[PDB]
Amino acid sequence: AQNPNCNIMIFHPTKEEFNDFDKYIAYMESQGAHRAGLAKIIPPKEWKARETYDNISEILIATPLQQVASGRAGVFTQYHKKKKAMTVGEYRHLANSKKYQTPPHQNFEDLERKYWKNRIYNSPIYGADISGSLFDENTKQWNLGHLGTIQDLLEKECGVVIEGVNTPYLYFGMWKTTFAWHTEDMDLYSINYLHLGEPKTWYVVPPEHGQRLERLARELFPGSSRGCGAFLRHKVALISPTVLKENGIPFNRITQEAGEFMVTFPYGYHAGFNHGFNCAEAINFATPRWIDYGKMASQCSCGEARVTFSMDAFVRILQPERYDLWKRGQD
Ligand SMILES: O=C(O)CNC(=O)C(=O)O
Ligand SMILES: [Mg+2]
Ligand code: NI
Ligand SMILES: [Zn+2]
Incomplete structure (x- = not known):
């Protein structure tokens, strides 16, 4: 079994290996990258996301959020x-x-x-x-x-x-x-590219140990846990590395810098923070190996998690038994 300790792996694809995205994800998995929940990909030196960032100041942040x-x-x-x-x-x-x-x-x-x-x-x-x-x-x-x-x-x-x-x-x-x-x-x-600015530090729990994190979270957030059987879908809870170590939860940490990609793998719990002004871009994606994770994914039906239009079909097709209750939470 590749990467049995579930360490975060860092990849340096050549320009030729950077052509076929799906193939490279599957390569990373062949080396065990998914076992960590998170991987870093450093693009070939020839590559660039765009020519400059000098003309981005007029982008609007319509609803900045004070945390x-x-x-x-x-x-x-x-x-x-x-x-x-x-x-x-x-x-x-x-x-x-x-x-x-x-x-x-x-x-x-x-x-x-x-x-x-x-x-x-x-x-x-x-x-x-x-x-x-x-x-x-x-x-x-x-x-x-x-x-x-x-x-x-x-x-x-x-x-x-x-x-x-x-x-x-x-x-x-x-x-x-x-x-x-x-x-x-x-x-x-998910895949996240740090376009510019200061770093982003990540923490991640290996997918095979995600339920250990969930059990800790139910202990540490006991009112939230009673309110919802999948309250980490609300995306509001933080637990420090010190606390995770005290409770024996397996995790790893890494810092992403500008110009680097991170990939999170199915059911890889992650959290983190930004070091200063930065801009990242991220999107979800799937591979064939995701399908079984989608079928098993927990869901928030309490009404808090409220998500995109496109999640409807995923629930409806992969989780038809849950569909009715989950949709009540969406409406
Ligand atoms: O960058 C952030 O604030 C959060 N990003 C992610 O959770 C991700 O890319 O999956
Ligand atoms: Mg602009
Ligand atoms: Ni994420
Ligand atoms: Zn909920």
Whole structure:
């Protein structure tokens, strides 16, 4: 069995290996990458996502989200308070202001310490989930706006044609902006490209150990657990590395820098934070190996998780018994 300790693997494809996305994902899996839940892909030196980032300031962040925490430093939830619209240029200035900027630090490990110690005492503003793409249309390799769609994968594997579309999302981050512990909708893969700016630190639980994380989360968030049998679908709970180590939960960590891709694998729980002003682009995708994970994926039916139009068909076809209850939660 490849990668039996479930370590995060880092890949350096050549330009020739960067041509066929599906084939490279399947290669990574042949080497055991999925066992970690997360892999890093460093693009060949010849590749670029686009020529420059000099003209992105007029992108609108229609609903910036202020991430307000409740709890203790290592075990907290966050809610998102909607703020007034602002442009990327306005948001970049805000991120760099004395109130929000990254503090002085020695290295990524010192910053990580400062994040865990101090996150809860601040409410950073995240420009998340913005439909769009920063890949140049002429970038033919690993262009997240040109991937094969999940609807087409389900059709190729299962023969059923379904409605829905699959497009990318931009994330504009600042120091302390946080992504809570989650797997993807329907336990899909995700791919995330860090276009510019400061790094993003990731934490991940191997898929084979995801239920250990879920059991801890039910213990640590006991009211939330009573409210919903899949409350980590709400994407609000944070648990620190220190707490995970104290409770024997297997995980790994890695820092993504600008110009690098990360891939999350089906049922790989992940969480993390941004080091300073940055912009990432991400999208979900599927492969044949996902289908069995989609069929088994938990679902939130309490009403909180509320998701895209396109998840309807996935539930309806892969999880027909759950469909009725899940759709009640959507409506
Ligand atoms: O970058 C973020 O805020 C969160 N991204 C992801 O969870 C992802 O790409 O799967
Ligand atoms: Mg612009
Ligand atoms: Ni994710
Ligand atoms: Zn729920």
